[PDB]
Amino acid sequence: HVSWRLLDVVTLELGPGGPRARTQRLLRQLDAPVFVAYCSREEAEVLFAEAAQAGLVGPGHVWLVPNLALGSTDAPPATFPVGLISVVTESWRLSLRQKVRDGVAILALGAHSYWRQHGTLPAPAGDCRVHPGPVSPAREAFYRHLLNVTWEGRDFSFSPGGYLVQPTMVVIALNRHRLWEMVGRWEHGVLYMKYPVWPRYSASLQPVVDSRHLTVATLE
Amino acid sequence: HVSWRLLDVVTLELGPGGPRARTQRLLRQLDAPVFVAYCSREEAEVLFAEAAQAGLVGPGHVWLVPNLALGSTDAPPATFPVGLISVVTESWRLSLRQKVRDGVAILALGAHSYWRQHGTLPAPAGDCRVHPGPVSPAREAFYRHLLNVTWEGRDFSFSPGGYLVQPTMVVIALNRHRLWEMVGRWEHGVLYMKYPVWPRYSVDSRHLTVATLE
Amino acid sequence: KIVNIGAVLSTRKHEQMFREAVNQANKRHGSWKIQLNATSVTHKPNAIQMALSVCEDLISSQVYAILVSHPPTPNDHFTPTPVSYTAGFYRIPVLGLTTRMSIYSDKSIHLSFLRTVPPYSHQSSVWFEMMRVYSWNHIILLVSDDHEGRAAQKRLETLLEERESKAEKVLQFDPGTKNVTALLMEAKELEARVIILSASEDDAATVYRAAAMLNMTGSGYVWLVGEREISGNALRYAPDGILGLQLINGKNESAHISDAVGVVAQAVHELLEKENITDPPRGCVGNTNIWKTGPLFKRVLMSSKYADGVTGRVEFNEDGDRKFANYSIMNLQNRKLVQVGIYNGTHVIPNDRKIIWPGGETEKPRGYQMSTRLKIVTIHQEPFVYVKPTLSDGTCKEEFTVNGDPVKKVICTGPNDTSPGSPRHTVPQCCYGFCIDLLIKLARTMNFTYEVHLVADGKFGTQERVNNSNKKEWNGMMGELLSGQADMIVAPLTINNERAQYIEFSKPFKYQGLTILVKKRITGINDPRLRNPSDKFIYATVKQSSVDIYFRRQVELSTMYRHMEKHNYESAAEAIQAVRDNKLHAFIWDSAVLEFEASQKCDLVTTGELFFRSGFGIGMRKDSPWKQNVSLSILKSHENGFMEDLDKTWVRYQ
Ligand SMILES: *[C@@H]1O[C@H](CO)[C@@H](O[C@@H]2O[C@H](CO)[C@@H](O[C@@H]3O[C@H](CO)[C@@H](O)[C@H](O)[C@@H]3O)[C@H](O)[C@H]2NC(C)=O)[C@H](O)[C@H]1NC(C)=O
Ligand SMILES: *[C@@H]1O[C@H](CO)[C@@H](O[C@@H]2O[C@H](CO)[C@@H](O)[C@H](O)[C@H]2NC(C)=O)[C@H](O)[C@H]1NC(C)=O
Ligand SMILES: *[C@@H]1O[C@H](CO)[C@@H](O[C@@H]2O[C@H](CO)[C@@H](O)[C@H](O)[C@H]2NC(C)=O)[C@H](O)[C@H]1NC(C)=O
Ligand SMILES: *[C@@H]1O[C@H](CO)[C@@H](O[C@@H]2O[C@H](CO)[C@@H](O)[C@H](O)[C@H]2NC(C)=O)[C@H](O)[C@H]1NC(C)=O
Ligand SMILES: *[C@@H]1O[C@H](CO)[C@@H](O[C@@H]2O[C@H](CO)[C@@H](O)[C@H](O)[C@H]2NC(C)=O)[C@H](O)[C@H]1NC(C)=O
Ligand SMILES: *[C@@H]1O[C@H](CO)[C@@H](O)[C@H](O)[C@H]1NC(C)=O
Ligand SMILES: *[C@@H]1O[C@H](CO)[C@@H](O)[C@H](O)[C@H]1NC(C)=O
Secondary structure (H helix, E strand, O other): OOOOOOOOOOOOOOOOOOOHHHHHHHHHOOOOOEEEOOOOHHHHHHHHHHHHHOOOOOOOOEEEOOOOOOOOOOOOOOOOOOOOEEEEOOOOOOOHHHHHHHHHHHHHHHHHHHHHHHOOOOOOOOOOOOOOOOOOOOHHHHHHHHOOOOEOOEOOOOOOOOOOOOOOEEEEEEOOOOOEEEEEEEEOOEEOOOOOOOOOOEOOEOOOOOOOOOOOOOOO | OOOOOOOOOOOOOOOOOOOOHHHHHHHHHOOOOEEEOOOOHHHHHHHHHHHHHHOOOOOOOEEEEOOOOOOOOOOOOOOOOOOOEEEEEOOOOOOHHHHHHHHHHHHHHHHHHOOOOOOOOOOOOOOOOOOOOOOOOOOHHHHHOOOOOEEOOEEOOEOOOOOEOOOOEEEEEEOOOOOEEEEEEEOOOOOOOOOOOOOOOOOOOOOOOOOOOO | OEOOOOOOOOOOOHHHHHHHHHHHHHHHOOOOOOEOOOOOOOOOOOHHHHHHHHHHHHHHOOOOOEEEOOOOOOOOOOOOHHHHHHHHOOOOOEEEOOOOOOHHHOOOOOOOOEEOOOOHHHHHHHHHHHHHHOOOOOOEEEEOOOHHHHHHHHHHHHHHHHHOOOOOOOEEOOOOOOOOHHHHHHHOOOOOOEEEEEOOHHHHHHHHHHHHHOOOOOOOOEEEEOOHHHOOOHHHHOOOOOEEEEOOOOOOOHHHHHHHHHHHHHHHHHHOOOOOOOOOOOOOOOOOOOOOOHHHHHHHHHOOOOOOOOOOOOOOOOOOOOOOOOEEEEEEOOOOEEEEEEEOOOOEEOOOOOOOOOOOOOOOOOOOOOOOOOOEEEOOEOOOEEEEOOEOOOEOOOOEOOOOOEOOOEEEEOOOOOOOOOOOOOOOEEEEOHHHHHHHHHHHHHOOOOOEEEOOOOOOOOEOOOOOOOOOOEOHHHHHHHHOOOOEEOOOOEOOHHHHOOEEEOOOOEEEEEEEEEOOOOOOOOOHHHHOOOOOOOEEOOOOOHHHHHHOOOOOOHHHHHHHOOOOOOOOHHHHHHHHOOOOOEEEEEHHHHHHHHHHOOOOEOOOOOOOEEEEOOEEEOOOOOHHHHHHHHHHHHHOOHHHHHHHHHHHOO
C-alpha cells in the first residue's frame, strides 16, 4: 500500500577493462539515502571500491544486495562497507556434513512416503550407452509424490519450478569486525528485528546517532 | 500588505557540456505557477533548453529574470521562450551618442554646481606612479557634491554606495515577433500598463477558458 | 608536459627558502610524465607598477597558480589587492598565504581566491562554544562600522539563530573616533553583564580607557575580545582578566609554504588527466579571453582532501575557509598571557591550571545582574483589579473586611483621569484586588520590591500595521512591556500563540474560556441570527483584544469580523452598561469576569457553556532569569489550597 516513490534507475558497464570516466561521472552525481544493487562478487568489489573513491560510504547511506554476491560467507573481502545487508536462506551456518545428511534424509523420507503409498521405489534407467529417454509414465508419479516433504522441524516445500517455496529465512549484516552476524528472522510472513533502530557506525564505531530522532516512553 | 504564499527554493548547478544529468530530474520534480530565474545568458540558454526537454515551459507558467541576464537587448537570441518579463532602466533612447551627451554634460554640471556657491574649479590628481594622497582633502566634498543632480526631467538622484536611487525604469517582455517591446514602466508612482490582460500566445495545455454568469 | 607554477614573496630570503622547498617537494614524483617548476619575485611600494610586474610574470611563463604573502610593511589592507584583481581576468587561481581580512572571503568580488588561514569571522564561532561552556545567554555585542564588523555581526547572528535564543541590543560606533562614552553609558543600564568587542587596536585602547573612566572594568563583570585587541599597544590600556585567543602558528607562514605547494602538488597530478587540459592562458596582452578550464581547476583544487601538512589536516570550506584550524586561549594574567585552552573545532579543553576573571573571584561568575525594584504594569479589570480614589490624608479607607482581616492595598499611579478625552492627569490611586494579593504573596516569597503603575492606552494590545507602513509594533500594554517601559506583567492576560514568540509565560493558574452575556434566552455560535447578522440584534465585543485576532484568523468566520469591525465598543467594563442600555444585546467575553458579573449584579444571564479554552498567566520578557522560580512558586500555592481559598474569599460569597 505504501507509495514507494522511485527516484532513478541507472544501468552501467563495469568490465575489468573499461571506461572508468563514464562510470565515475554517472556515479558521482546521485541523491538518495538507500541503495539496492544487483551484481556479482567480482562486480561488487570493483563497484564498491569505485564508490569508496567518490565519497558515498559513510554512516548515512545503506546498501542492500541480493544473495548473488557475498559468495564466500566465511572470508568477507575488503572494500565492503560495514553494515551491508543481504538475505540468505536457512542452513546459513549448518555443516557441509550436516547439509548432505539432510539431503539424504529428505530423499529417504520421500522414498519412505512412496513405499507407504504403494510399496517400493522405482527401478532406475541410467544407460549412457542408449539413453533413449523413452517415456514418463511411472517416474512422474514418483516426482509428484516427492514434491512435498518435512523432516525434523525443517519444513521444506516445493513448487513446479525447481526452487523451494516459503522457508524460514534470515537477514544478516556485517558487525564492526567485518563478520557476518544474524540480525533478523523471517517466518510465515511476519518479520522480526533484533535491533529496534538501525545502529549506524562511522569511521570506527562511535555511532554518530542522528539529531532528529528520539525515544518516547509511555505506559498502558 | 499581501500574502505571498511562496512555494519553495531550488538551487541548481550545471556544467552544461556533460554534468547536467541529475539537474534534469531535479528540474522535472518541481511544480509551481510562477518561476523567477537568475543566471547568465549562456546559462539561461542551456537552462531553457533543458526546461524545454523536461516540459515545464507551458503558457500556464511565467518566467521572471533580472537585468543581469538578457543583456543583448538589441539582438533577440535563439532558443528563448516567448512571453517572459525582464526589467531595465531607461535605455531605449540610449546609444553611443546618447551616452556621450549624458556623461560630459552631467560631469560639467556637477563641476559647476559646487562653484555656484563659494566654489572654485577643481584640479586633477597627481599620477599613477607616485602613489600620493593618503588623506582625503576638502575637495572630497566636491565628489560629495556629485550626489545631487538633475537634468532633462529624468531624475539622476544618487546613493551613497555609487548607484542611483529613486530611478525611472521600465518593464519589458518578448512578443510573438521575437523582438523586445515596451510593456510598462514605473514613473515614480505605481505601475502602468499597455496590455491590460496577458495574451498567453503560442494540445494538452493549461489555463483553460471558463465562462459563467452570476 | 612540464607543468609550471609560480609564487611571489616578500623578504627575498623566504624566496630562496621557497625555491629549496619546491625543488625538494618535486621529489614526490619523477616519472618523467609530469614535472614542476617555480619562479619568484619580491614586492614593491607602488601598486600600479607592482600589478604591471604581475603582468610581466604572467607573460614570462604560462603560470598555473600564483602565491602571495605579506611583507613587514604595516600597510595591511593595501597589500593583496592588485594580484587578485589582475589574475582574476583569466581565472588564474591565487593562494593567499596569510591575510585575515573579511572582504576577501566574498567570491563575487575576488572570484578567484583560496586561503589557508581563516578570516576574522570564524573566530566568532569559538566564542559561541565558550559561551555554551559556562551557560551565558545574555550578551552585549559591541562592534565597529567597518565591513569586518558587519561580517562578524552577521556570523554571530546566524550562529545564535541556529539555537535561536536571542541577541541583546547590538550597538555600533563609527571607526577612528574619540569619546565613545555616550554609547557605553547608554548601554550600561541593561541587565546583561558580558560584552564582546572586535574593532581596531587604537579603537580598542580608546574603549579600554573610556570604560576605565566609566568604571566598567571592575568586579563581577567579564568581557572578551577578538585577536588583534590584545596586540600592538592595546596592552598599555588593558585590565587584567579579559579573555583572549590567537591562532596556533600564524605570522610565520614559512611552514605555510610547506603546505601550499603540497596541496597544489596533490592537485596537479590529479588534474592533467581529466579530458582536455592542454593549456593555460599564454600571454598578458591582446588576448582578451579567459582560461577554458579555470573554473574546473579551481573547483577540483577546492575540494582537495590533503593528507598532512605542517599545520595538521587542512581542508577547505564552500568559499575557501581554513576548515578546522587551531586556536589557543590566553588570559591577561597580570599583564601577561597564559595558554589556558585549545580549540580545535568541537570544544576547548581546560587543560591549564587556573583562570582569573576581572573581579578577582576564583569561581565562575554568572552575569544577569538581578534587579531589586521592578516596574509592574497592570490594567483595570472588575473582579481582579480594584482601583479607587484616595482620601486626601494620604491613602484610602483602611478598614476591616467581612471577616475582619485587613484587605491589603497598594498605591498605583497611572491613567489620565479620563480615557476618551483629556490631556493628562497622572495621579496616584489606591489599588487592591485578587492579583494584588497574589503579587503580595509572590513578593513575600521571593524578596521583591514593587512600584505598580497602570497603562495609558487603556487597552491590552494587538498587532497593528499603522498608516506609516512598517513592522506591526505591539500596541499599548505589550509595547510598554517590550520597549522597557515595564519589566513584568501581572494581570488577567490570556496565553496565545501570537504572543508566545516574544514573551515567556508561567504555568496557568486559572482555567477559563469564552462565554456570551445577555440581559433577559440565547444560544452558542450556531444561530442564523449570528450566521446571517440581523438589523435588530447587535453583536459586539471589546476592541483591541485577543478575540479580535481570533475572529481575524478564521477562514469561514471572516464575515463575522465584517460585522464586528463595524461597531465594537473600544472600551472596558463601561461597555457593560451597553447591556444595561438595551443597545447591545450579546457581549462575547471571557468566562470568569463575565460570570462574576452575573452573580454580583442582577437581570444579567449567561447562556449555555463555553466554546473555547485558554488560561491566565504571569508573563515576562524573553528568557528572564526568574521564570522557573516564579512558576514553581505558583504551582506550590496551587498545592496548598491557597488559590482555592482566594477564589472563595473573593468570588464565592456573592
Ligand atoms: C545636494 O546637492 C546640492 C547641489 O549643489 C549641494 O548643495 C549644498 O547645500 C547646502 C545647504 O546649506 C549648502 O551648504 C552651504 O553651507 C555654507 C556654510 O557656511 C553656507 O555658507 C552656504 O550658504 C550653504 O548653506 C551648499 O550649497 C551645498 N553644500 C556644501 C557642503 O557645499 C550639496 O552637494 C548637496 N546638499 C547637501 C546638504 O549636502
Ligand atoms: C503430499 O504428501 C502426501 C503424503 O505425505 C502425498 O499425497 C498422496 O499422493 C498420492 C499420489 O497419487 C495419492 O495416493 C494421494 O493424493 C495422497 N495419499 C495420501 C495417503 O496422502 C503426496 O506426496 C503429496 N500430495 C499430493 C496431492 O500429491
Ligand atoms: C616556522 O615554522 C617552521 C615549521 O613549523 C619552524 O621550523 C621548525 O622549527 C622547529 C624548532 O626549531 C624544528 O624542530 C623543526 O624541525 C622545524 N621545521 C622545519 C621544517 O624546519 C620555524 O622555526 C618557524 N619559524 C618561526 C619564526 O616561527
Ligand atoms: C578536538 O579536541 C577535542 C577535545 O580535546 C576532542 O574531543 C574528544 O573526541 C572524542 C572522540 O575522539 C570524544 O569522546 C569527545 O568528543 C572528546 N573526548 C573527551 C572529551 O574525552 C576531539 O577528538 C579533537 N579532534 C577533533 C574534534 O577532530
Ligand atoms: C531561584 O531559586 C533558588 C532557590 O530558591 C535560588 O538559589 C538560592 O540562592 C540563594 C542566594 O543566591 C542561596 O542562598 C541559596 O542557597 C540558593 N538555593 C539553593 C537551593 O542553592 C536562586 O538564586 C533563584 N534564582 C532566581 C533567578 O531567582
Ligand atoms: C622553469 O623556471 C625557470 C626559472 O627561471 C625558467 O627560467 C624556465 O623558463 C622555466 N621553464 C618552464 C618549462 O617552466
Ligand atoms: C566627552 O568626554 C567627556 C569627558 O570629560 C564626557 O564628560 C562627555 O560626556 C563626553 N561626551 C560624549 C558625547 O560622550
